[PDB]
Amino acid sequence: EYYEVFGEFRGVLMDKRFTKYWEDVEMFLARPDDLVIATYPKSGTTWISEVVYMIYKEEDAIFNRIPYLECRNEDLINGIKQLKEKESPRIVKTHLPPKLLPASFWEKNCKMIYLCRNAKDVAVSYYYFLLMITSYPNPKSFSEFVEKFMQGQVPYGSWYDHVKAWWEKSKNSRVLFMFYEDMKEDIRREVVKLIEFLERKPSAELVDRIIQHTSFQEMKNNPSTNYTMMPEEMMNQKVSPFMRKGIIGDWKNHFPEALRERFDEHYKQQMKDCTVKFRM
Amino acid sequence: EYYEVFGEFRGVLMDKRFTKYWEDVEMFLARPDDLVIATYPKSGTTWISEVVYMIYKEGDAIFNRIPYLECRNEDLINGIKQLKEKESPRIVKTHLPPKLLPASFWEKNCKMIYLCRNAKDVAVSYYYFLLMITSYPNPKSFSEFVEKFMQGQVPYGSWYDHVKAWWEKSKNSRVLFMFYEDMKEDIRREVVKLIEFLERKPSAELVDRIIQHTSFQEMKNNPSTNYTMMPEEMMNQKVSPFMRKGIIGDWKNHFPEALRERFDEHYKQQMKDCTVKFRME
Ligand SMILES: Nc1ncnc2c1ncn2[C@@H]1O[C@H](COP(=O)(O)O)[C@@H](OP(=O)(O)O)[C@H]1O
Ligand SMILES: Nc1ncnc2c1ncn2[C@@H]1O[C@H](COP(=O)(O)O)[C@@H](OP(=O)(O)O)[C@H]1O
Ligand SMILES: C[C@]12CC[C@@H]3c4ccc(O)cc4CC[C@H]3[C@@H]1CC[C@@H]2O
Ligand SMILES: C[C@]12CC[C@@H]3c4ccc(O)cc4CC[C@H]3[C@@H]1CC[C@@H]2O
């Protein structure tokens, strides 16, 4: 059952396998040069993760090169253990809201990159992800999933609270805030911005290489990034592939008119006092 | 389909996920002090693995403490990688027949322990294991599974060829040959023998600690050894538990009379000239 798999932890709905040993995450020891990549699920984490890795490097699965902090499935999968054995400088992936991130990261003043995507398109991507994950109950319908999304009753909680809290943290010059739609409409600009934030020289050669290797077509056929290195028993891509469409606007093919009006109205009430600038 | 999952490799039927990157196994680098624990599937590997580990520690999931050499599932599970990162002295688990084991192990003259169990009881245990593994097609019936077993058309091939080849290897004083039924009927004797082979003192305190910790009842309740640390999506124990019965003679509850006669007759022709001494039961 849905609520046998997921349960509220400190006001955030979470996969119980990731909170059973919460102590390991809360007491995590950060290093001054650690870099944190944070996102709400299905906002382009894999895309920006590969861009940053390439920058660091001017085959092994991406989930091995950049460990997923809080991911845990008893003794078979353990992100914390992977990080303890990782040589510096480490790149750390996470989907946690600011109130749940290990305090050591703030204490040590580590650099961080937060990426977001428009809410309607995130909901479409998340719906298919639940179908893909074998141990996650399939929603009875897209609409039923959207009602849960609006209530923040999906893994990692409310998208609204997630974006608002990370936007506030981005007041800090060491926390970079970025958008999926900006990477889609002006990739060269976003890559140069990332190279500069990480204190490196943006050369035409480096910038072109990254733009070339990180296209959706490129990443969909790279076994290291398309998640085919992860067993079908856990993630069945026969049901739905990880690199699905990679576009802006798929909400137009899933949201009936009545539902869209209610969602957009709800969005307004939620994001009233937030200054974040999403692309038109 | 059965043969979409399994394929013959150098005359041995194998899970294709374990042979896709065979080069990683063939070129494996052994160390002089490595210890190899080899068995045909479902013969008591987990039981003897825990006994040996306890000996090393003189009184974390078992698949992490003692890596399964050839086990591989793309980038999620990789026994070779685990071993490269393991501090010595390493304990290595494997289900491979002698002709498929990495040659480096023979070149370095490493010590090894081989364990076997009577064929009829192994077939019963193996049948339930296929039901347990989610990605393995469930046999249509026990009899159909037995026909495949007699033909060597099950993962890791012919049980007959496996036992005969390892028995020949045991001529070497550094390769110990043992039986599941001997551990069941005379555990203290078998434990003292293992402590001595690994060059340690079989004190009364030590022997007694091992015997109590490795009973079927204890291990069935120990999350480290009962394979509950492995996701149900891969191994569903709701279908059949890993620590199933742990007895001698369950074949009597599965083999119809007609089938048993044919199996035993076939066994005779396969093992006619083998001097191996199985226990009377
Ligand atoms: N190089 C790339 N360019 C564009 N979209 C990409 C991409 N790599 C991944 N994506 C998209 O990012 C989403 C997955 O996000 P995450 O990595 O956070 O889980 C998917 O969205 P869609 O389901 O809409 O296709 C996927 O197709
Ligand atoms: N401490 C113990 N004592 C007796 N049998 C044990 C045991 N631990 C495991 N077993 C048995 O060993 C078999 C599993 O073997 P392996 O470890 O090689 O996969 C199972 O046989 P059954 O299915 O007949 O019960 C299991 O119950
Ligand atoms: C860890 C699992 C595989 C990886 C899955 C994943 C992988 C990547 C990601 O960004 C989010 C998630 C959420 C659910 C995870 C799954 C829960 C059960 C499964 O074993
Ligand atoms: C590696 C798997 C889990 C562990 C299983 C195992 C575990 C222990 C063992 O002695 C043999 C086997 C054979 C099949 C394996 C399975 C094949 C698919 C699954 O992911």
Curated annotation (Swiss-Prot), chain A:
Tissue-level expression: Testis and at very low level in the placenta.
Biological process annotations from GO: estrogen metabolic process; female pregnancy; sulfation
Outcome following mutation: K93 to R/S: Strongly reduced estrogen sulfotransferase activity. Strongly reduced affinity for estradiol
Enzyme class: transferase
Subcellular location, record wording: Cytoplasm, Cytosol
Modified residues (Phosphoserine): S143
Catalytic activity: estrone + 3'-phosphoadenylyl sulfate = estrone 3-sulfate + adenosine 3',5'-bisphosphate + H(+); 17beta-estradiol + 3'-phosphoadenylyl sulfate = 17beta-estradiol 3-sulfate + adenosine 3',5'-bisphosphate + H(+); (24S)-hydroxycholesterol + 3'-phosphoadenylyl sulfate = (24S)-hydroxycholesterol 3-sulfate + adenosine 3',5'-bisphosphate + H(+); 3beta-hydroxyandrost-5-en-17-one + 3'-phosphoadenylyl sulfate = dehydroepiandrosterone 3-sulfate + adenosine 3',5'-bisphosphate + H(+)
Active site positions: H95
Residues where substrate binds: K93, T94, H95
Effect on the protein upon substituting K42R: Reduced estrogen sulfotransferase activity
Annotated residues for binding of 3'-phosphoadenylyl sulfate: 42-47, 117, 125, 180, 214-219, 244-246
InterPro entries attached to this UniProt entry: P-loop_NTPase (IPR027417), Sulfotransferase_dom (IPR000863)
Pfam families: Sulfotransfer_1
Disulfide bonds: none
Subunit architecture: Homodimer.
Database matches in PANTHER family: SULFOTRANSFERASE SULT
Protein name as annotated: Sulfotransferase 1E1
Natural source organism: Mus musculus (Mouse)
Gene name in the database record: Sult1e1
